[PDB]
Scaffold this motif. Sequence first.
Motif, PDB file in Angstrom:
ATOM      1  N   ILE A 231      20.823  22.018  30.307  1.00 25.61           N
ATOM      2  CA  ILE A 231      20.039  20.745  30.310  1.00 25.61           C
ATOM      3  C   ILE A 231      20.918  19.618  30.872  1.00 25.61           C
ATOM      4  O   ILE A 231      20.426  18.870  31.739  1.00 25.61           O
ATOM      5  CB  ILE A 231      19.504  20.412  28.901  1.00 25.61           C
TER       6      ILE A 231
ATOM      7  N   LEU B 117      23.502  37.736   8.622  1.00 26.40           N
ATOM      8  CA  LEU B 117      23.052  36.351   8.297  1.00 26.40           C
ATOM      9  C   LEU B 117      23.945  35.317   8.995  1.00 26.40           C
ATOM     10  O   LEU B 117      23.415  34.558   9.830  1.00 26.40           O
ATOM     11  CB  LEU B 117      23.054  36.142   6.778  1.00 26.40           C
TER      12      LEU B 117
ATOM     13  N   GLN C 187      14.519  28.887  15.636  1.00 29.24           N
ATOM     14  CA  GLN C 187      15.868  29.091  15.036  1.00 29.24           C
ATOM     15  C   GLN C 187      15.733  29.196  13.512  1.00 29.24           C
ATOM     16  O   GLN C 187      16.410  30.059  12.921  1.00 29.24           O
ATOM     17  CB  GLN C 187      16.807  27.951  15.443  1.00 29.24           C
ATOM     18  N   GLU C 188      14.896  28.345  12.908  1.00 30.87           N
ATOM     19  CA  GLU C 188      14.620  28.314  11.444  1.00 30.87           C
ATOM     20  C   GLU C 188      13.805  29.551  11.046  1.00 30.87           C
ATOM     21  O   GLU C 188      14.074  30.106   9.963  1.00 30.87           O
ATOM     22  CB  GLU C 188      13.879  27.031  11.062  1.00 30.87           C
TER      23      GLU C 188
ATOM     24  N   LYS D   1      16.123  11.362  29.271  1.00 25.61           N
ATOM     25  CA  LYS D   1      16.333  12.803  28.959  1.00 25.61           C
ATOM     26  C   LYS D   1      17.626  12.969  28.152  1.00 25.61           C
ATOM     27  O   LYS D   1      17.621  13.765  27.192  1.00 25.61           O
ATOM     28  CB  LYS D   1      16.393  13.636  30.244  1.00 25.61           C
TER      29      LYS D   1
ATOM     30  N   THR E 106      20.564  20.518  10.335  1.00 28.91           N
ATOM     31  CA  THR E 106      19.893  21.845  10.252  1.00 28.91           C
ATOM     32  C   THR E 106      20.949  22.938  10.056  1.00 28.91           C
ATOM     33  O   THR E 106      20.864  23.649   9.041  1.00 28.91           O
ATOM     34  CB  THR E 106      19.028  22.119  11.489  1.00 28.91           C
TER      35      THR E 106
ATOM     36  N   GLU F 201      22.249  26.495  26.151  1.00 31.56           N
ATOM     37  CA  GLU F 201      20.952  26.000  26.693  1.00 31.56           C
ATOM     38  C   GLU F 201      21.046  24.486  26.928  1.00 31.56           C
ATOM     39  O   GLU F 201      20.459  24.009  27.917  1.00 31.56           O
ATOM     40  CB  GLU F 201      19.799  26.355  25.748  1.00 31.56           C
TER      41      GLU F 201
ATOM     42  N   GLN G  81      15.772  36.825   8.780  1.00 32.47           N
ATOM     43  CA  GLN G  81      17.078  37.497   8.536  1.00 32.47           C
ATOM     44  C   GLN G  81      17.370  37.532   7.030  1.00 32.47           C
ATOM     45  O   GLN G  81      17.973  38.525   6.574  1.00 32.47           O
ATOM     46  CB  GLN G  81      18.198  36.796   9.311  1.00 32.47           C
TER      47      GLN G  81
ATOM     48  N   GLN H 204      16.171  32.736  11.091  1.00 30.90           N
ATOM     49  CA  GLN H 204      17.029  32.778   9.874  1.00 30.90           C
ATOM     50  C   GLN H 204      16.167  33.196   8.679  1.00 30.90           C
ATOM     51  O   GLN H 204      16.618  34.065   7.908  1.00 30.90           O
ATOM     52  CB  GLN H 204      17.709  31.435   9.605  1.00 30.90           C
TER      53      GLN H 204
ATOM     54  N   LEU I 162      17.095  11.852  24.577  1.00 28.62           N
ATOM     55  CA  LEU I 162      16.345  12.902  23.832  1.00 28.62           C
ATOM     56  C   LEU I 162      17.300  14.034  23.430  1.00 28.62           C
ATOM     57  O   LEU I 162      17.162  14.537  22.299  1.00 28.62           O
ATOM     58  CB  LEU I 162      15.195  13.424  24.700  1.00 28.62           C
TER      59      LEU I 162
ATOM     60  N   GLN J 276      21.630  24.734   6.500  1.00 26.19           N
ATOM     61  CA  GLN J 276      21.336  26.190   6.615  1.00 26.19           C
ATOM     62  C   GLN J 276      22.570  26.988   6.179  1.00 26.19           C
ATOM     63  O   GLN J 276      22.419  27.904   5.346  1.00 26.19           O
ATOM     64  CB  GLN J 276      20.968  26.580   8.049  1.00 26.19           C
TER      65      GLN J 276
ATOM     66  N   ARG K  80      13.175  20.843  30.738  1.00 24.25           N
ATOM     67  CA  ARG K  80      13.367  21.884  29.689  1.00 24.25           C
ATOM     68  C   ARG K  80      13.954  21.260  28.416  1.00 24.25           C
ATOM     69  O   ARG K  80      14.006  21.969  27.392  1.00 24.25           O
ATOM     70  CB  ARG K  80      14.280  23.002  30.206  1.00 24.25           C
ATOM     71  N   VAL K  81      14.376  19.990  28.474  1.00 24.87           N
ATOM     72  CA  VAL K  81      14.923  19.219  27.316  1.00 24.87           C
ATOM     73  C   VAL K  81      13.823  19.037  26.256  1.00 24.87           C
ATOM     74  O   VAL K  81      14.171  18.787  25.084  1.00 24.87           O
ATOM     75  CB  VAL K  81      15.520  17.870  27.771  1.00 24.87           C
ATOM     76  N   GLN K  82      12.552  19.173  26.651  1.00 26.65           N
ATOM     77  CA  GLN K  82      11.359  19.043  25.767  1.00 26.65           C
ATOM     78  C   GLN K  82      11.147  20.326  24.947  1.00 26.65           C
ATOM     79  O   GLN K  82      10.333  20.280  24.004  1.00 26.65           O
ATOM     80  CB  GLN K  82      10.120  18.732  26.609  1.00 26.65           C
TER      81      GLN K  82
ATOM     82  N   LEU L 133      13.650  21.992  23.331  1.00 26.41           N
ATOM     83  CA  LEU L 133      14.686  22.022  22.260  1.00 26.41           C
ATOM     84  C   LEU L 133      14.016  21.966  20.882  1.00 26.41           C
ATOM     85  O   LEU L 133      14.524  22.631  19.958  1.00 26.41           O
ATOM     86  CB  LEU L 133      15.658  20.850  22.443  1.00 26.41           C
TER      87      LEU L 133
ATOM     88  N   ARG M  17      12.477  25.458  20.142  1.00 27.57           N
ATOM     89  CA  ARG M  17      13.630  26.397  20.051  1.00 27.57           C
ATOM     90  C   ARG M  17      14.278  26.296  18.663  1.00 27.57           C
ATOM     91  O   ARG M  17      14.679  27.347  18.129  1.00 27.57           O
ATOM     92  CB  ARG M  17      14.657  26.101  21.149  1.00 27.57           C
ATOM     93  N   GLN M  18      14.379  25.080  18.114  1.00 27.66           N
ATOM     94  CA  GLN M  18      14.984  24.800  16.782  1.00 27.66           C
ATOM     95  C   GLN M  18      14.039  25.269  15.668  1.00 27.66           C
ATOM     96  O   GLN M  18      14.549  25.670  14.604  1.00 27.66           O
ATOM     97  CB  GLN M  18      15.303  23.311  16.631  1.00 27.66           C
TER      98      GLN M  18
ATOM     99  N   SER N 168      23.020  31.963  17.200  1.00 28.83           N
ATOM    100  CA  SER N 168      21.880  31.065  17.528  1.00 28.83           C
ATOM    101  C   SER N 168      22.393  29.670  17.907  1.00 28.83           C
ATOM    102  O   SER N 168      21.838  29.084  18.859  1.00 28.83           O
ATOM    103  CB  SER N 168      20.885  30.999  16.393  1.00 28.83           C
TER     104      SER N 168
ATOM    105  N   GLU O 100      17.928  15.370  19.483  1.00 33.75           N
ATOM    106  CA  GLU O 100      17.733  16.791  19.077  1.00 33.75           C
ATOM    107  C   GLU O 100      19.052  17.363  18.540  1.00 33.75           C
ATOM    108  O   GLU O 100      18.993  18.187  17.607  1.00 33.75           O
ATOM    109  CB  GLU O 100      17.203  17.623  20.248  1.00 33.75           C
TER     110      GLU O 100
ATOM    111  N   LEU P  85      21.942  28.071  21.777  1.00 38.67           N
ATOM    112  CA  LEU P  85      21.253  26.755  21.885  1.00 38.67           C
ATOM    113  C   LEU P  85      22.174  25.750  22.587  1.00 38.67           C
ATOM    114  O   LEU P  85      21.672  24.976  23.424  1.00 38.67           O
ATOM    115  CB  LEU P  85      20.862  26.262  20.487  1.00 38.67           C
TER     116      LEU P  85
END
Lengths: 374, 374
Positions: A202, A184, B333-334, A90, A104, A198, B340, B337, A93, A108, B322-324, B326, B329-330, A191, A97, A195
Motif C-alpha cells: 500500500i 495459536l 484476522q479476528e 490514503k 487488536t 500488505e 484457531q 483467530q 487512512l 488478542q 487497496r488501502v480500503q 485493510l 482483512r482485519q 497474520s 487502520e 498484513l
Amino acid sequence: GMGFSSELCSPQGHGVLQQMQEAELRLLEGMRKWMAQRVKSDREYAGLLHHMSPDSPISQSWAEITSQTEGLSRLLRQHAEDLNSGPLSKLSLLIRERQQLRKTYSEQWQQLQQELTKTHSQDIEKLKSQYRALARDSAQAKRKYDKAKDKYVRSLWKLFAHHNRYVLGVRAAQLHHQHHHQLLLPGLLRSLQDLHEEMACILKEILQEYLEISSLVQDEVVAIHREMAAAAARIQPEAEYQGFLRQYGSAPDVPPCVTFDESLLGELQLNELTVESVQHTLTSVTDELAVATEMVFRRQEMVTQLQQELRNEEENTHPRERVQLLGKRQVLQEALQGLQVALCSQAKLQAQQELLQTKLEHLGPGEPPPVLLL
Amino acid sequence: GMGFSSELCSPQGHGVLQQMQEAELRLLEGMRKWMAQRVKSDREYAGLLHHMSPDSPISQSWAEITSQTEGLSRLLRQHAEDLNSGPLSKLSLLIRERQQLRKTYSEQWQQLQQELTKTHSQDIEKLKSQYRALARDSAQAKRKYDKAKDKYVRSLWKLFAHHNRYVLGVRAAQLHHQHHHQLLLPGLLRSLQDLHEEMACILKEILQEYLEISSLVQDEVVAIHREMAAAAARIQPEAEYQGFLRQYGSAPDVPPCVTFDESLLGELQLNELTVESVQHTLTSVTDELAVATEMVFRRQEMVTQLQQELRNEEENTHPRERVQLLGKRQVLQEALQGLQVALCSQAKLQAQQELLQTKLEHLGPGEPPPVLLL
C-alpha cells in the motif's frame, strides 16, 4: 524461512513487534507532514507563478510564453489538490487502520496468554491443591480404620474421582500448550506479518502515486515547456518590423527643393566687374573642399577602425553575451552619421566649385564681357 | 523591400518610431518585472521544498526520496540565482542602452533638421532679402543717372557680386536637400532599424536563456525524479522484515509442559467405584466436543464467507485503492483467530474423550477391578 511466527514467538518478540508498530506509525506520521508541506509548496508556487502575470513576432511570442507560464501555475495547483485528495488522504487512512492493529494484536495476544495461564497453570494448581487435600483426608480415614470402613470408602471414592478429573485437566492443559505454541501464537504472528507486508505494498503504491502527481518532469509539464520554447524559437529578428511598416508606413515626405527665384531679376554673371570675384571664390571654395575632403578622410578612418574593432568582438563573444556590443555599435552609429554629414558638406562645396570652374572655362581666353549701360 | 529608411522617411514616421522605442521599453520593463517574480517564485519554492525535511527497504528508499527532494530544493535556488545574474541582468542592460538610443536618435534627427532649415531655408531667405535690397538700390542709381555713373557702377558691382553669391547658396541648398532626403535621413532610419533588429536577436537569446534556466523538465530535474522513482521501485514488500528478523529474531520461548505430578500419589483409575464416574464423563465430554465441533463449523463458515468476499473485492479494486481493504482483512484476522481457538477447544475435548474411551475398552467385558484394602 524467517518470519514473525518462527523468530518472534516469545514474550521478548512481542515487545519487539509492539515497538515496530509504533516506529512505523512514527515514520508514516512524518510522511504525512512531509507530503502536506509539498501540498503547501506547490500551491504557494502556483500563487507565485500566477502573480508574474501589436502584430509583432516577439509580442505574439511573449503573449504565449506568459500565457503558458499561467498554464504551468494552474498545473501546480492541480498537483497540490490531487496530492491532498489522493496519496495524502490514503496515507491518513493507513495510519488510522494501523492504530487499530496496535490494540487488536496486543489485546488478542494477551487474551491467548490469559487462556494458557488458566488451562495450563491456574486450573491445574486448583486440581493439585484438592488432590493433596483428598489424599491427606483419605490417609486420616485409613489410620482411623465398622464406620471407619464406610468413611474410608467415601474418602477413596472422591480421591479416585478427583485423580481422574486431574488426569483429564492435565491432558487438556498439555494439548492447549501444544495448540498455543504450534498454532495459536504462531498463527497470530503469521497474520500480523502478512498484513504488515500488505501495508508495505500500500505504502509503495502511495509513495509512487505521490511521485507521479508531484512530478515536475511529467508529460503535461514537458507539453507546456515545448510550447514556450517553440514560441521563443518562432521569433524572426529581421521580420520584427514588417507588419509595423505595413500599417504605419507612408511615402517619403520630400519638400519642394530650392530653385533660383526669377522675381529678384540660375546663371553666374561673368562680366568685367565680377570676373576677379569669381576667380577668388573658386580659390576659396577649392581651399574649403580640400579641408572638407580631409574631414571625410578622418571620419572614414574612424568608421573603419570601429567597424574592424566590432568584427573582432563579434568573433570573440558568445552569441548570448552580444548585449555588451550595443555600446560600441551606437558609437559606430554616431561615427557613420558624422561621415554622412562630412560627405554632404564635401558634396555641397563640389557643386559650388563646378559652377565656378565651368563658367570660368566657357569664357576661356575671351575678354571679360563688358557692362553695357543703355 | 520595406524599411524605416523608405517607409518612415517623414516627420510623421519620426513620431511613429519615437513611440515604438517607448512601447518597446514599456514591454522590456514588463519582461524584467515578469522574470524578477520568477526569481522570487523559484527561491520561495526552494524554501518551501527545503522546509519538508533501521535497515528497512522502505526506510532506505524513504531516506533517498526525501534526500533527493532536498536536491530539487537546492536546484530551484540555483535556477533563481542564475536567472537573476544571467538573462535578468542582460535585460536590464538592454533597457539602459535603449534609453540612450531614444535621446541619441531624436537629438541626431533634430540636428539634421536644423542643418537643412539653415542651408535650405534660412541662409537662402537672407540671400533673397539682400538681393531685393541691392536690386532696388541699383534701380535708384539708374534713375539718378558724372558721379551718377560711378555710384550706379558700384550698385551694379555689388548686385552682380551678390547675385553670384546667391547662385552658389542655391546650389549648396539644392545638394543638401538631395543628400538629406537620399542619404542623411534614410541612412539614420536604416541604422535605427538594423540596431533594433540586432536588439530583437539579443531579446530572443535572453528569452531562450530564461526558458533553459527556468526549465523544470531539464536533464538535471529528470536525473533527480528518476533517482526518486528508482528508490520507490526498489521497495520489496515481502522482504521488508528480513533484516528486522536477523537482528531482533530469537528461538521460540516454549515453557515446560504440564506432566502429571507423582508427588500427589497419568493413568485413569478404572475400579468398581470410578467405573460409573468414567462412563458419565465420556457422555458429557462427547456432548461438549459435538458443541465444540459445531463452534468450529460456524467460524470456518465465517472465515470462508470473509475470504470469498475479499477475493471478490481484490479483483474489483484498482491496485492503489487497496488501502480500503485493510478493514475487511482485519475482520478476517479476528475470524481466523476465533477459528484457531475453537480448534484448540475442540482438540482439548478430543484428547480427554480419547483417554476415557481407550480405558473403558481396555477393561471391555471384564468386572470393574475391585478396591483391595490391606
